Amino acid sequence: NLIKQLQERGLVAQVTDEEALAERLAQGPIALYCGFDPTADSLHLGHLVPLLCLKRFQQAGHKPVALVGGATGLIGDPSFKAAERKLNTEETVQEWVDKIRKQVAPFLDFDCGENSAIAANNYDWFGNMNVLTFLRDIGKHFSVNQMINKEAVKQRLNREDQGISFTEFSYNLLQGYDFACLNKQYGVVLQIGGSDQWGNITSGIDLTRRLHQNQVFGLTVPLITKADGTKFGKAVWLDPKKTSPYKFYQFWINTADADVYRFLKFFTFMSIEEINALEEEDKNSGKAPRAQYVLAEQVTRLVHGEEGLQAAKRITECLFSGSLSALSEADFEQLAQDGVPMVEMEKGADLMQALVDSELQPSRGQARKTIASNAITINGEKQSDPEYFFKEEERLFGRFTLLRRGKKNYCLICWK
Amino acid sequence: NLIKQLQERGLVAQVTDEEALAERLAQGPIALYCGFDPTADSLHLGHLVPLLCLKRFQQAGHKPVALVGGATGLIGDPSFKAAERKLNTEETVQEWVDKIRKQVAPFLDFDCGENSAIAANNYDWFGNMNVLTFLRDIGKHFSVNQMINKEAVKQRLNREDQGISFTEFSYNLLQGYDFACLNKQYGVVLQIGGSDQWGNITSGIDLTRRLHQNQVFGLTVPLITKADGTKFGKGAVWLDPKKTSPYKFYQFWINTADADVYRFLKFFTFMSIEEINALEEEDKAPRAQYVLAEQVTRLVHGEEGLQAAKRITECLFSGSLSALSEADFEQLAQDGVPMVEMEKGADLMQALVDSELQPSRGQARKTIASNAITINGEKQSDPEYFFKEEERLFGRFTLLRRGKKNYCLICWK
Ligand SMILES: N[C@@H](Cc1ccc(O)cc1)C(=O)NS(=O)(=O)OC[C@H]1O[C@@H](n2ccc(=O)[nH]c2=O)[C@H](O)[C@@H]1O
Ligand SMILES: N[C@@H](Cc1ccc(O)cc1)C(=O)NS(=O)(=O)OC[C@H]1O[C@@H](n2ccc(=O)[nH]c2=O)[C@H](O)[C@@H]1O
Ligand SMILES: [Cl-]
């Protein structure tokens, strides 16, 4: 029972007519979909849970359709958003559509027979749809009375100053019609998404009934919350030019103990039995948990590949050990991007001024004392001379020196 | 000052930035518009007040644009309407558009130089507009918080069972864009309509500022109410003679209450305000109801219509029917007097029973013998009488009257 398997992983928030859907899944393969709007040049970790759920359905023999919102991205989803978004240009949205489509594709199998994945774009049917056709054929089936009362937009109708445009208010209809289109085009009978999408999904179920006289289903995945109550992202992009593999890997390494097993269930393809054995091992080891290391390895390999995972571990190992000889120029570029705090400095700066400019020390007088106390390392090597100037060999690849005050305060000097 | 002149006739419900509009009108001709949606094959008396208002602006030298809602008629205006309307087909709406455009055209001058009237249809811009273009270029300028607070749709936003579809809720944006579109195409700076249109007009004023950075204005005419509190023109009083005959039209006006007659001359005629006031004091039989009937009937149905209406009225009052033509009897059968269809050979007693002028043959016999019945205005007191062929006027019609005023028209099969 796929729904029950997803429920044990904590991956089912809500499901329409669960018995009928489970009966349909057990009968044979179904086609299902999940949509992703282009609001940026990359997806982030928030988008990964439903994307990986498409794969989980596919591994059970179902056919996933990954829709990218070429049209909906020109409108903007208001669902549980406190503020009206500015409209994006057609040129920017198209550039983002191509990037997202390409980023999504490796997570799904496009070559596994009948249930091979399908890439879809709702601009195909909205780009040539007349406004009177939309208002009459689609709009007549929507009650404004019900629409203004949906949880996703109700808060936006409290104050005019923090209100909602007719553009964003119409979004629900567009996503509604997409479900009817995919049902007609590919026999799609299930739509999945995060729990904020419930109302957009159910409008599609109701419209598919009205337009195509077909019974279709909805299933949502919970939005991730941490046990402490704080917000999940602290955003973590899938694109390495936005969030380096090192920072990505470190984010998972630093997962709280109360979230690590749930995150393994949400973000990995490890069996429930293995995750339960990992939790049990951590419970009776007599040591701190090792699950964070397993979670970091799994998700980093999934998103950034074996090469990305090895680069994340090599940077982590070098930063910890102090020995930087194993680092490449590309590794230092991850560090400069977002790995450790960084500063740009003109070559010839003494150690004292590097400490002040890097904000590792408030003044040169303070810098002098901390150097003399043997609290500073240069590329992991201790340097106790206050009057010290860096040697040309300490500027790695001619432009990198890593300063560390104590055991954990880093600043990468990027020489100009 | 034209606004002052309209206020004196009681034709101004509301007006935006009034000093500026009066100033714009005073410096020279403006282009203005009023829209009419196709919800039937004819306009009715309710539509006459803003229609004549376009002509009142045109006489003052302004350029009227008469818009027929070929696109808006496919959506449906919910303004102050208690219930959602069913969608009409594209084929039906197109038939109504052509009938309404042709009914409006004689009320305005399409050949008077610079200020010649223009017929417009919003299907010309909405019929091929892409949905994303509409939602982005127009929809972004509309606040749902503001829309749900418009007086015209409030009664519809309390309960789902007396609710509003997304279709009718989007209407306000189409009428809003129409004003912006007419401002760009023809330099239209004023929109008029009845008071129910206030919110649709003010949305157009706001959108024109947002889209074209132009200042435009709105003016509404009051919805006609009676002194007694009842509904005006109550079914409806249509402009189409095949729906409401010129006789029935004329009679409706003759029977206007004295408390409404002077206000109605101001709203429905081109008579000067000086003339109407002079007519008001003089009544302290009033000739006003007769003057109102004469003016509006001539305006809608022409001199030929007015003469037929007067000719039928006169023949029914006198009982002398020789002046009635075949077409006059056709007006009587349509809606002029109660009518009953009958097979030729029916006796007088049967005609009185079938027409419901008498409850039984035995009673009809007593009524006929009492000299209460006229056949085409001639007394007939033989209870056993059968109609003569010459009494079937144009081989089709016989008018019975019981007593001094109860008529029934027999239409022979
Ligand atoms: N309206 C959806 C995209 C969509 C869906 C179906 C269509 O037919 C058309 C468009 C939307 O705006 N999605 S999203 O791009 O913001 O996110 C994609 C998915 O990721 C989930 N998500 C997003 C952010 C987050 O932190 N957590 C989360 O689960 C959302 O619920 C959605 O299912
Ligand atoms: N929404 C308007 C038509 C319209 C106007 C402007 C546009 O850009 C597009 C469409 C509408 O539905 N009008 S109506 O066809 O119902 O009536 C036409 C006019 O007659 C007035 N009217 C209607 C009935 C009545 O009893 N009294 C009255 O004054 C209305 O206020 C409107 O100005
Ligand atoms: Cl006879």
Which amino acid is residue A183, in one-letter code?
A: N
Closest CA to A154 of A82, A77, A76: A82
Of the candidates A201, A42, A29, which has an alpha carbon nearest to the alpha carbon of residue A117?
A29
Number of cross-chain residue pairs from A and B with Cβ atoms under 8 Å apart: 117
B140/A164 CB distance under 8 A: no
- Our answer on whether the CB atom of B223 is closer than 6 Å to any ligand 2 atom is yes
Handedness of CA A193, A197, A203, A207 (dihedral sign): negative
Does A136 contact B167 at a Cβ distance shorter than 8 Å?
A: yes
Cβ–ligand 1 distance for A73 under 6 Å, the answer no
**Using CA atoms, how far apart are residues B342 and B187, in angstroms rounded to an integer?**
60
Token pair for A233: 């992202």
The kind and range of the H/E element at A193 are strand A188-194
Which H or E run includes A20?
A: helix A18-27
| Nearest residue, CB atoms, B165 vs list A75, A134, A140 | A140
Strands, E, within A42-149: which ranges? 63-68, 118-121
CA–CA distance, B31 with B190 (Å, rounded to integer): 7
Neighboring chain A residues of B77 at a CB cutoff of 8 Å: none
Closest-lying ligand to the alpha carbon of A44? 1
Residues in chain A: 416
Q: Where are the alpha helices (DSSP H) in B285-400?
A: 288-318, 326-331, 348-354, 361-369
Tell if the CB–CB gap between A143 and B160 is shorter than 8 Å: yes
Q: Which residue of A has its CA nearest to B87?
A: A136
Q: Which residues of A touch B130 (CB under 8 A)?
A: 127-131
AA identity, residue B53: C
Beta strands across the sheet bearing A118-121 = A14-15, A217-221, A188-194, A31-36, A63-68, A118-121
Indicate the residue type of A341: P
CB–CB of A132 and B71 under 8 A? yes
What's at A3, amino acid-wise?
A: I
What distance in Å separates the CA atoms of residue B380 and residue B361, rounded to the nearest whole number? 16
Q: Is A148 on the interface with B (CB under 8 A)?
A: yes
Please give the single-letter amino acid code of residue B380: Q
The residues, any chain, with a CB within 8 Å of residue B374's CB and separated by 6 or more, are B319, B380, B400, B401
- Other C-beta atoms closer than 10 Å to the C-beta of A199 total 21
Ligand 1 pocket check for A223: Cβ under 6 Å: yes
What DSSP letter does each residue of B277-309 carry, written as one string? HHHHHHT---SHHHHHHHHHHHHHHHHHHHHHH
| Resolution of the solved structure (Å) | 1.9
SS3 content of chain B, % helix, strand, coil (to 5): 50, 15, 35
Q: Say if residue A21 is in the same domain as residue A107.
A: yes
Do A140 and B170 lie within an 8 Å CB cutoff? no
Domain that holds residue A299: 225-326
CB contact under 8 A, B143 and A134: no
Residues B193 and B251 occupy one common structural domain: no
Report the separation in Å between the CA atom of B2 and the middle of ligand 3, taken as the mean of its atom positions: 63
In chain B, what residues touch A136 (CB-CB under 8 Å)? Answer: 74-75, 87, 167
Give the residue among B107, B109, B26, B117 at the shortest CA–CA distance from B63: B117
B147 and B53 together in one domain: yes
Going from the Cα of B412 to the center of ligand 3, the distance in angstroms, rounded, reads: 10
Q: How far is B198 from chain A (nearest CA, A)?
A: 20
A92 touches chain B (CB under 8 A): no
A73 DSSP assignment: G
- What CATH number corresponds to the domain at position A266? 1.10.240.10
How far is it, in rounded angstroms, from Cα A121 to Cα A124?
6
Find the helix or strand (DSSP H, E) in which A249 lies.
Answer: helix A245-253
Experimental method used, please?
A: X-ray
Q: 3-state DSSP helix/strand/coil percent for chain A, to nearest 5?
A: 50, 15, 35
> Residue length, chain B?
413
CA distance B221 to chain A (A): 29
Comparing CA positions, the residue from B403, B411, B399, B237 lying closest to residue B316 is B399
Residue with tokens 């909602």: A164
In the numeric block, which tokens belong to residue B131? 């949905």
Using alpha carbons, select from A255, A109, A87, A258 the residue that is nearest to residue A170. Answer: A87
- Closest residue of chain A to B130, computed from CA coordinates: A130
B144: nearest CB among A126, A146, A165: A165
Taking the CA of B388 as reference, the closest ligand is 3
The minimal CB distance from B136 to the residues A87, A128, A136 is found for A87
Q: Which of B236, B125, B117 is nearest to B178 (CA)?
A: B125
- Out of B147, B164, B167, the one facing A166 most closely (by C-beta) is B147
Residue whose CA is at the smallest distance from ligand 2 atom 33: B193
Both B201 and B237 in one domain: the answer is no
Q: Is residue A87 part of a domain?
A: yes
Chain B, nearest residue to A146 by Cα: B160
Residue B165 and residue B295 share a domain: no
Which of A130, A143, A157 minimises the CB distance to B128? A130
Of B17, B10, B58, B8, the closest CA to residue B34 belongs to B58
B373 CA → ligand 3 middle, Å: 16
A350 and A313 housed in the same domain:
no
Closest chain B C-alpha to A50 CA, distance in angstroms: 27
> How many Å apart are CA B108 and CA B87, to the nearest integer?
30
**Would residue A335 count as lying in a domain?**
no
How close is the Cα of A388 to the center of ligand 1, in Å?
54
Instruction: Identify the H or E element spanning B402.
Output: strand B397-402
Task: Quote the distance between the C-alpha of residue A8 and its chain's center.
Answer: 22
CATH label of the domain that carries residue A35 = 3.40.50.620
Residues in chain B with CB shorter than 8 Å from the CB of A164 are 143-145
What is Dmax (Cα atoms) for chain B? Answer: 83
Smallest CA–CA distance, residue B154 to chain A, in Å, is 11
Alpha carbon separation from B159 to A145, A148, A266, B85, B185 (Å, rounded)? 7, 12, 41, 16, 40
Q: Ligand 3 centroid to B340 CA: how many Å?
A: 16
Whether A332 is covered by a domain: the verdict is: no
Beta partners for B143? A165
Residues A194 and A293 in one domain: no
CB B132 to CB A127 under 8 A?
yes
Q: List own/partner pairs for A98-102 with CB under 8 A and 24 or more apart.
A: A99/A38, A99/A41, A99/A42, A99/A239, A100/A36, A100/A38, A100/A42, A100/A43, A100/A68, A101/A66, A101/A68
| Same-domain check for residues A415 and A387 | yes
> Coil, helix or strand for A127?
coil
To the nearest 10 degrees (0 to 180), the angle between helices B258-268 and B288-318 is 110
Integer CA distances (angstroms), B241 to B42, B57, B187, B250, B327, in order? 10, 27, 36, 11, 12
Nearest to B145 among A126, A164, A173 (CB): A164
**CA-CA-CA-CA torsion sign (B161, B167, B169, B172):** negative
Q: Which of B221, B255, B285 is the last residue of a domain?
A: B221
Q: Distance between CA atoms of B133 and A75, rounded to whole angstroms?
A: 10
Optimal mutation site among B132, B140, B156, B169, interface A, most CBs of chain A within 10 A: B132
Q: Which ligand is nearest to the CA of A81?
A: 1
Looking at the fold, whether A104 and A156 belong to one and the same domain comes out as yes
Are both A177 and A283 inside the same structural domain? no
Residue B214 shares a structural domain with residue B234: no
Cβ neighbours of residue A313 closer than 8 Å, sequence gap 6 or more: A249
Residues facing residue A221 across a β-bridge: A194
Q: Is A220 helix (H, G, I), strand (E, B) or coil?
A: strand
Q: Which ligand is nearest to the CA of B350?
A: 3
CB A289 less than 6 A from any atom of ligand 1: no
In angstroms, the CA B213 to CA B321 distance is 65
| Helix (H) or strand (E) run with residue A199 in it | helix A198-212
Judge contact between A306 and A314, C-beta under 8 A.
Answer: no
If asked whether residues B306 and B348 sit together in one domain, one would say: no
Name the residue among A246, A85, A212 with its Cα closest to residue A138: A212
* DSSP codes joined into one string, B20-88: HHHHHHHHS--EEEEEE--SSSS-BHHHHHHHHHHHHHHHTT-EEEEEE-TTGGGT---TT-SSPPPPP
Phi, psi of B410 (to 5 degrees): -90, 125
Identify which of B185, B178, B166 has the alpha carbon closest to the alpha carbon of residue B129.
Answer: B178
Q: What is the CATH number of the domain that holds A388?
A: 3.10.290.10
Question: What's A85's DSSP letter?
Answer: P
Number of structural domains in chain A: 3
Ligand nearest to the CA of A40: 1
Torsion of CA B113, B114, B117, B119, to 10 degrees: 110
Domain end position, chosen among B265, B298, B328: B328
Q: Is A197 a pocket residue for ligand 1 (Cβ < 6 Å)?
A: yes
- Give dist(CA A150, CA A144) in Å, integer: 10
- Number of Cβ atoms within 10 Å of the Cβ of B10: 13
> Where does a domain end: B194, B221, B248?
B221
Does residue A68 contact residue A96 with C-beta atoms inside 8 Å?
A: no
Residue B35 in contact with ligand 2 by CB distance below 6 A? yes
In chain A, whose CA is at the least distance from the CA of B135? A167
| Interatomic CA distance for residues B7 and A171, integer angstroms | 45
Of A241, A177, A246, nearest to A212 by C-alpha is A177
In a domain, A331, yes or no: no
Q: If you search the block for the tokens 């929109």, which residue do you land on?
A: B191
A263 alpha carbon – ligand 1 mean position (Å): 19
- What strands lie across the sheet with B14-15, from one edge to the other? B14-15, B217-221, B188-194, B31-36, B63-68, B118-121
A135, closest residue in chain B (CA to CA)? B167
Atom of ligand 1 nearest to the CA of A175: 8
What Cα–Cα distance (Å) separates residue A142 from each residue in A171, B77, B153? 12, 16, 16
